[PDB]
Assembly symmetry: C2
Homo-oligomer: 189 residues x 2
């Protein structure tokens, strides 16, 4: 199937899923947003569930490329972890793909399909530069990179989730900054 | 209305809400668990929504008393914060009242009633001993007690939520320990 067409549908679906959640979203409204028939959307995503799965997978997909870009910007392994989470905070503030993936994952119990497991992709992703930081002497003695990865992913998720629940992520950058300062003070050698 | 009767109903409702969530719970099943008629439960909670609100309020209610008890155990203000969160981790592992309050709050978007605002009660609760820690010189210079309270509540929530989603809180004490070590390393003077 056409990558152009799939990307169009996924962008519209992310806007609608982020704005309305799973139940308020309809394949009919996705089709209208992209100027396609219902049948053209079902050809690519035969069910609303398959569309939700695809949106969730897509909101994890850009991050390995982002981590390579950050290393080319000259950041150390430990700084790379910090910059990844900063970009993620910005994406939660601004990007319907990120907002939709997290909203669908929060509605996980009531979507009748196996969504990708949450948290594990980011945990594994950050463990590698944390391990590189350990090998370079950049991590405080006694800090286990795998534990640091779990703690960062959990704390970041909590921060952005609280910010969404109480303030629609209006304050997310200020909440991340204060949490970031604490956590990275505790990680740096 | 009788406090004995309300407590009985709230204990049964917490077990059923934690086990099944809001939709799977029924006033009928709550009544059966306590050996009361449906009408006796509706006399005390006229709607399923009013029962959910009460369960959420109750899962916040024990914590001021717990904080006073911890101070009598001889803990400093900063240690009191650590011990409060440790007790909360244990409660999330073991206590249907805590599990039900958090499950209802996660199902917040799809319960047709104004539940208590999440996170704010714990944030305000921990800010007071954090401020006492600041005044006693127990907090690292530059750490704002209100920022520390927000960061701890967000990170703790995230940790327990990840543990519930992926492992049904089986590993919650090990996940809290590793997060606790980082965060309190960064808070202590």
């Amino acid at each position: 199937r056409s990558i152009k067409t799939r990307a169009q549908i996924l962008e519209a679906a992310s806007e609608i899923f982020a704005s309305r959640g799973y139940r308020g979203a309809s394949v009919k409204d996705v089709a209208e947003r992209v100027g396609m028939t219902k049948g053209a959307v079902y050809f690519h995503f035969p069910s609303k569930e398959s569309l939700a799965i695809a949106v969730v997978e897509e909101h994890y997909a850009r991050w390995p490329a982002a981590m390579e870009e950050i290393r080319i910007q000259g950041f150390t392994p430990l700084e790379t972890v910090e910059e990844m989470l900063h970009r993620a905070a910005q994406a939660f503030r601004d990007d319907p793909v990120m907002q939709a993936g997290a909203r669908l994952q929060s509605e996980r119990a009531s979507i009748d399909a196996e969504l990708p497991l949450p948290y594990v992709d980011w945990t594994h992703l950050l463990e590698v530069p944390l391990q590189d930081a350990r090998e370079a002497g950049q991590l405080r003695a006694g800090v286990d990179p795998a534990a640091a990865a779990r703690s960062l992913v959990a704390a970041f998720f909590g921060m952005q989730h609280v910010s969404d629940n109480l303030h629609q992520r209006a304050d997310i950058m200020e909440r991340w900054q204060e949490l970031r300062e604490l956590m990275f003070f505790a990680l740096r050698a």
